[PDB]
């Protein structure tokens, strides 16, 4: 008897008559990829297919999963949204996810501090879990990084239903020299807590291209740890202000 979401199901060796099964266990230990599950003819073994199917059912739910408004409020965050009203429209309309709605623009001018050196934006994007798991690990030492030795720090705020190009409009309105967007990248099969940082020097809606951004991707406990990544993003921000450059325009 087996739960397909258990650690025993994850560690399963399926290879039937192994050449060297001690290598097989230490290969299974070396990676989170679905290695060493064996075969039936050229096809997957049944338990490997079943656990794949189980993980996909779990993965589908995490794309529709939304964080409480109350959780955003408990973080001390301004919630703002894009032009997108709901999760279903988000998935079909990236162009509306890349623009603040009319009430969002006015809220940012109302409530956020003007012409910062560094502006942290946080958005659910395509994975809520990427925010909710990681937030308390990444965000406090990021704020305490940019403050302690340094700069005019923006006040951090949530954008609901954000796509990456929205940080250009955020840069223009708030007058920000560096914009950092921490955003949920699209959910994997067997994980959902993968966060990316997208960061850009002094952006403009008409003129900024994607290559002008620096990406730091795969921030989680199975990737780059959110505490360790916080000091990466601060050092990136310091380099961005020194060089007056981001993305492909940066040295080294």
């Amino acid at each position: 008897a087996l739960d397909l979401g258990s650690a025993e199901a994850k560690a399963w060796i399926g290879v039937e008559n192994p050449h060297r099964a001690d290598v097989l266990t230490e290969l299974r230990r070396s990676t989170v990829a679905r290695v060493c599950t064996g075969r039936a003819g050229p096809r997957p073994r049944t338990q490997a297919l079943l656990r794949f199917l189980a993980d996909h059912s779990r993965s589908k739910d995490t794309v529709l999963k939304e964080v409480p408004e109350e959780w955003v409020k408990a973080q001390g965050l301004l919630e703002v949204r894009s032009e997108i009203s709901d999760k279903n429209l988000y998935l079909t309309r990236p162009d509306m996810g890349r623009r603040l709605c009319a009430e969002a623009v006015e809220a940012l001018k109302a409530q956020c501090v003007a012409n910062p050196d560094v502006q942290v934006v946080i958005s659910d994007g395509l994975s809520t879990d990427a925010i909710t798991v990681n937030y308390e690990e990444i965000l406090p030492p990021l704020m305490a990084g940019l403050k302690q030795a340094g700069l005019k720090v923006g006040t951090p705020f949530f954008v609901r239903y954000g796509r990456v190009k929205i940080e250009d409009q955020i840069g223009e309105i708030l007058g920000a020299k560096v914009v950092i967007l921490l955003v949920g990248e699209r959910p994997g099969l067997g994980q959902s807590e993968s966060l990316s940082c997208y960061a850009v020097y002094s952006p403009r809606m008409a003129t900024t291209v994607e290559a002008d951004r620096t990406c730091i991707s795969n921030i989680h406990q199975g990737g780059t740890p959110p505490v360790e990544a916080a000091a990466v993003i601060v050092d990136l921000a310091k380099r961005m202000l020194e060089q007056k450059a981001s993305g492909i325009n940066m040295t080294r």
Binding site: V15, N17, P18, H19, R20, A21, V23, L24, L27, S30, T31, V32, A33, R34, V35, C36, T37, G38, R39, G41, P42, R43, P44, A48, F52, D55, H56, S59, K60, T62, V63, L91, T92, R93, P94, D95, L126, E185, R186, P187, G188, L189, G190, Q191, S194, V209, E210, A211, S217, N218, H220, G222, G223, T224, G247, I248
Partner: protein, 453 residues
Amino acid sequence: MKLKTTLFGNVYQFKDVKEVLAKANELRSGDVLAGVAAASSQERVAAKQVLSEMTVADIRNNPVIAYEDDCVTRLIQDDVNETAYNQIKNWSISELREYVLSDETSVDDIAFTRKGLTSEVVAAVAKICSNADLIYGAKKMPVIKKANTTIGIPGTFSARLQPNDTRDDVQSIAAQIYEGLSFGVGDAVIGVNPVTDDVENLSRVLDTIYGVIDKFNIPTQGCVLAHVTTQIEAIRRGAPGGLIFQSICGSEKGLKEFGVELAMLDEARAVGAEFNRIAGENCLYFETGQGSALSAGANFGADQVTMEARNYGLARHYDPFIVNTVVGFIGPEYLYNDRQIIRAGLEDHFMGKLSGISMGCDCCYTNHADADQNLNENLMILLATAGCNYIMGMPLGDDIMLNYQTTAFHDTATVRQLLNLRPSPEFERWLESMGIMANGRLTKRAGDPSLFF
């Protein structure tokens, strides 16, 4: 030309070639998002008929971004054989479709004829093809290239080993390599998308790949799929050069989005020729896919099939070892479901082969798309019958890192044994020597990465 037809007594008028090309597309969510789709099935068929009656000249002389404004358009137009063009310029697109599909049209006939085409004309043919048209048409247009393996020989089927890791951990990359080779995956390339973009890390990932290649004397090539500039940097500084990769887009603005100049790809060719461990004459590797130009704001009112065709016209200039579309890499906003992703996969592959590039497909989907692993298995088999040069392999198709599902190591072995297809002949020889393959089929002790230890 006519921009106009009458269908069931009702007149259907379109403004330009660009609109006719767009609305002739089979329904997809990307064309609706771009605002360029047909309003009905009737207007789709009317667009198809208008397109079919337009000449090769009509569509050649109206590219969707103009010559003077776009370096990809210039590259496509300047590469035309004008003698081949002049032979076919007064053919209708209906006549060109039937020419491509004809059993009296040989591989050698199409070899000259395709040099008279532009990417927009290549798009125009695909748009009036059925699914079986796209599959049969692609099948009778083989494209063969050579690195350390030969890819694309009829009766063969290759696979990229894609050993990706969330930290670029060298034990986890190695584990996935040994698993892939034990299923006979890796004759296209052993190709890692890296986390960090950076000469020390690129060289270490390449050292890991080529550690395995050199130990077992494997006829294949390695690749690391960072930006082309950092690849060139790393290879110049003494990392092993296999294939050199770039993601490409079908307009100048799309290339600027990607941070790509045309002269980087010139440089990659020159660096390949100086540095790279490749026996044959092809060493470049491009990846493509519908929606990328629309994402970039760089489609200029054109549909994503026409834009994707222009990728292949750009790619053809550089005579790469391999190209694949990454067919459902992005998500539902450009291709929504099973049926759209299959159709795009068949379109992309047909258009690549018509453009004369070594065309494969990452048969894939994302978890926010209306799609599952049965779609990948549907599409990989359809495309294999179309003579798709290669697919990907990952452990059960789970990318732990790029956060999508592609094809399993299993799936390449399945396709080969289902359809009586072999690997690349050089790689097949190696598999036979390792005891992994006999007569095209996995042996008993295949599928087991512990064979290598």
